[PDB]
Amino acid sequence: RSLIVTTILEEPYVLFKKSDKPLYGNDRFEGYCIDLLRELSTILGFTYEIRLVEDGKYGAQDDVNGQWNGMVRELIDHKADLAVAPLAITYVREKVIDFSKPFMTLGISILYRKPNGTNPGVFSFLNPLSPDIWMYVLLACLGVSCVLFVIARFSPYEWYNPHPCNPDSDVVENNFTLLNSFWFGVGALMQQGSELMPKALSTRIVGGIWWFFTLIIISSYTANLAAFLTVERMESPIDSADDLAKQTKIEYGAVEDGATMTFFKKSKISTYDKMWAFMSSRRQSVLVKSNEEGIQRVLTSDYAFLMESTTIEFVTQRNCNLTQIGGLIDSKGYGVGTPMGSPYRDKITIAILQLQEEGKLHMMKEKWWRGNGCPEEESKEASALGVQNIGGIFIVLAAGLVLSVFVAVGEFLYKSKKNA
């Protein structure tokens, strides 16, 4: 006798073999879920007649008359003898049919776009030194220039003789004022030397140690920028569901009235209360109505989509824009369906545990999920550095020339006032 195996089509479980040579009979189908069934028939004894569900659904109640819709209706009415399909073991189904012990484990997880690094900021020339170091080198310019100003006063060898023309023109002038001491410090830091050079041994040590400080700072900026521009190490804003529970910029998602959205409704964990407070209020914006439509909204928006973990492992290897941003939120499993009180539950159970010990469930999953190579990134050929990369030095230049005109007005007003 041949068994009636009911079955639905999702990729890579059960998919139409699109080969030539028509008049196909029971060889129309391929996939992981068809390779499982031929491994069962080898290890059990049966022949299988693959007979698709004539409703296109997995199975649920209608909540008005209480009648099952799909494979679990073909399993309660004995129209099928197996249900080898992505049929998730849950509580309302197993009070009606009998499942075997799982051949595949999953959970809820997150789709999001892989980080890209094409807009690093109009700044981010400023990353090779930490903002502590960009601030401590600002204070060291203020520190050394005050120490230069103070030391050059009570250093009698800095008090030199200007006007060398008259040999005894007794006038004593120090060129280390307060303004000229910052211009040594700002001058020495930016590698273009100033017109002032210290002439006493007390001020040549301050100038000499600020020069060695400056070499180590610029050589650490140029070397760590050569590290950043060689090894591009880019990261995502969110790295979990709790890091995503705070982000109001990235908006969440679910299939409308699915197994994934129902989990957040019945949840009592504090993080998944906040994630359902979001999607219930912002309904028709984040709650998509298909998992294929939800992949497009990750792709054409800033959108983190909550769906099953076995689809994300499939989709993110057919599309290298896409990645998985967590672990597993729920925990469910795919079970081979079996009608209620049937001798086939315990035989598929010991079969699935037999194919697992051999390594056959892993080799079948790596054949149907690991599809396209998705060319995992290398130390990529570097591209020319542009306005998207350095960028913001044209801002601090234009903000530095505006500050100059406000001082050039100020120097004109101040001199003309004290002239009169």
Ligand X SMILES: O=S1(=O)NCN(C2CC2)c2ccc(F)cc21
Ligand Y SMILES: N#Cc1ccccc1-c1cc(-c2ccccn2)cn(-c2ccccc2)c1=O
Residues that bind ligand POV (CB under 6 A): 119-124, 126, 131, 134, 136-141, 143-144, 146-147, 182, 186, 189, 208-209, 212, 215, 217-219, 221, 387-388, 391, 394-399, 401-403, 405
Residue 238: strand, helix, or coil: coil
> How far, in Å, CA of 124 to CA of 111, rounded?
28
With 0-12 / 13-18 / 19 or more C-beta atoms within 10 angstroms meaning exposed / middle / buried, residue 329 is buried
Q: Which of 9, 29, 5 is nearest to 18 (CA)?
A: 29
User: Contact between 324 and ligand NAG (CB under 6 A)?
Assistant: no
- From the list ligand Y, ligand NAG, ligand X, none, which binds 355 (C-beta under 5 to 8 Å, kind-based)? none
From Na ion, ligand Y, ligand POV, none, interface partner of 226 (C-beta below 5 to 8 A by class): Na ion
Q: Which of 2, 19, 105, 290 binds ligand X (CB under 6 A)?
A: 105
Binding partner selected for residue 118 from ligand Y, a second copy, ligand X, none, CB under the kind-specific 5 to 8 Å limit: ligand Y
Instruction: Tell me whether residue 86 is annotated as binding.
Output: yes
The helix/strand/coil state of 188 is helix
19 in contact with ligand NAG (CB under 6 A): no
354 binds a second copy (CB under 8 A): yes
323 binds a second copy (CB under 8 A): no
CA 85 to CA 78: how far, in whole Å?
17
Nearer to ligand POV, 258 or 391 (CB): 391
Total residues contacting ligand NAG by CB under 6 A comes to: 3
Closer Cβ to ligand Y, 125 or 149, answer by number? 125
118 belongs to the binding site for a second copy (CB under 8 A): no
Nearest in space to 84 (alpha carbons), one of 30, 12, 16, 13 = 13
Residue 11 vs 243, nearer CB to ligand NAG:
11
Question: Is 112:298 a contact under the CB 8 Å cutoff?
Answer: yes
Asked if 67 and 73 count as a contact pair (C-beta separation under 8 A), the reply is yes
Say whether residue 235 binds a second copy (CB under 8 A): yes
> Which residues 287-346 are close enough to bind ligand X by CB under 6 A?
331-333
Q: According to CB under 6 A, which residues from 218 to 277 bind ligand Y?
A: 220, 224-225, 227-228
The answer to whether residues 301 and 319 touch, using CB atoms and an 8 Å cutoff, is no
Residue 103 binds which entry of Na ion, a second copy, ligand X, none, CB below 5-8 Å type-dependent? ligand X
Which of 94-110 are b and which e, b meaning 16 or more Cβ less than 10 Å from the residue's Cβ?
eeebbbbbbbbebbbbb
Q: How many residues bind ligand X (CB under 6 A)?
A: 13
Is 232 a known ligand-binding residue?
Answer: no
- Is 304 marked as binding a ligand? no
Of 38, 42, 377, 408, the one binding a second copy by CB under 8 A: 408
Instruction: Show contacts of 296-302: CB within 8 Å, 24+ apart.
Output: 297/253, 298/111, 298/112, 298/113, 298/253, 298/322, 299/113, 301/251, 302/249, 302/250, 302/251
Decide whether 104 or 261 has the Cβ nearer to ligand X: 104
- Give 152 or 288: the residue with its C-beta nearer to a second copy: 152
Q: Which partner from the list a second copy, ligand X, ligand POV, none does 122 bind, CB cut-off 5 to 8 Å by kind?
A: ligand POV
Distance CA(100)–CA(408), nearest Å, equals 85
> Which residue, judged by CB position, is nearest to ligand Y in the bound state?
228
Partner whose footprint covers residue 82, from ligand Y, ligand POV, ligand NAG, none (CB < 5 to 8 Å by kind) = none
Q: Which CB sits closer to ligand NAG, 191 or 321?
A: 321
Stretch that binds ligand NAG, among 15-23, 31-39, 131-139, 315-323 (CB under 6 A): 315-323
Nearer to ligand NAG, 15 or 299 (CB): 299
Which residues are CB-contacts of 10 (< 8 A; sequence separation ≥ 6)? 86
- Sorted by sequence, the CB contacts under 8 Å of residue 400 that are 6+ apart come out as none
Contacts of 352 (CB under 8 A, 6+ apart): 100, 101, 102, 103, 336, 361
> What gap in Å lies between CA 54 and CA 73, rounded to an integer?
11
Task: Figure out which of the listed residues 41, 124, 319, 356 binds ligand Y, where binding follows CB under 6 A.
Answer: 124
C-alpha–C-alpha distance, residues 113 and 321, integer Å: 6
15 binds, among ligand X, Na ion, ligand NAG, none (CB under 5 to 8 A by kind): none
Comparing C-alpha atoms, which of 78, 356, 94, 379 is closest to residue 227?
379
Q: Which residues of 347-362 are buried (b: 16+ CB within 10 A; e: fewer)?
A: bbbebbeebeeeebbe
Among 103, 182, 264, 278, binds ligand X (CB under 6 A): 103
Give the Cα separation of 349 and 336 in Å (integer).
Answer: 9
**CB of 352 closer than 8 Å to CB of 105:** no
Binding site for ligand X (CB under 6 A): 89, 101-105, 331-333, 352-353, 356, 361
Contacting positions for ligand NAG (CB under 6 A): 319-321
